[PDB]
Amino acid sequence: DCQWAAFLCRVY
Amino acid sequence: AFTVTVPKDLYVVEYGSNMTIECKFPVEKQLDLAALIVYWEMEDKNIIQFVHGEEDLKVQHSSYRQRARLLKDQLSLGNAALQITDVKLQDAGVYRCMISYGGADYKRITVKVNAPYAAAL
Ligand SMILES: *CC(=O)Nc1ccc(NC(=O)C*)cc1
Ligand SMILES: [N]
């Protein structure tokens, strides 16, 4: 998932 | 592992009503805002962006601004609850909750919008 991918970056 | 679960992964909601779809995440001790991040999206539209308690009306996609909110009281129960008022036919589709809280996971929820013939609409 691209949304999932972007979400892990911003958080971690 | 930190697991997010959904009580319903399919919702049928009345046209013109309010809907609340829910994602559950584990909260053992008292909920720590400093550790909690919640994102709700659907079809690349940003709906909720909740960072350690911080939110910003501006990042919310225009089709959901003033209609969509995270129910704050529910978080301390381990319930990420998205409420959308005045449900439209364009709201049917697939929603994603993404939660970070000592670990990270996400679930998809499918929403169907119906218009019962004897309902308010
Ligand atoms: C498919 C895709 O979009 N992957 C993607 C998007 C954004 C990011 N952001 C960061 O890495 C910080 C990663 C992967
Ligand atoms: N990180």
Residue numbers in the entry:
A (entry chain B): 6 to 17
B (entry chain A): 18 to 138
Verbatim from the authors:
A screen for PD-L1 binders afforded two clusters of Helicons (C61 and C62) that were both predicted to compete with PD-1 on the basis of their on-phage competition behavior. Cocrystal structures of PD-L1 with these two Helicons showed that the two clusters both engage the PD-1 binding surface of PD-L1, but occupy distinct α-helical sites on it. To assess whether this is an indication that the FP28132 / PD-L1 complex is a dimer in solution, we performed analytical size-exclusion chromatography and time-resolved fluorescence energy transfer (TR-FRET) experiments with PD-L1 in the presence and absence of FP28132, FP30790, a non-PD-L1 binding mutant of FP28132 that differs by one residue (FP28141), and BMS-1001, a small-molecule PD-L1 binder that has also been shown to induce protein dimerization. We observed clear evidence of PD-L1 dimerization in the presence of both BMS-1001 and FP28132, but not in the presence of FP30790 or FP28141.
To target disease-causing proteins that are inaccessible to small-molecule or antibody therapies, we are exploring the use of a nature-inspired drug modality that exploits the intrinsically favorable properties of synthetically constrained α-helical polypeptides (Helicons). Here, we report a rapid, high-throughput screening platform utilizing phage display that enables an unbiased mapping of the α-helical interactome of a given protein without any prior knowledge of its structure or known binding partners. Analysis of 14 high-resolution crystal structures of Helicon–protein complexes across six different protein domains reveals a range of binding modes, all of which are “side-on”, i.e., mediated exclusively by Helicon side-chains rather than involving main chain amide interactions.
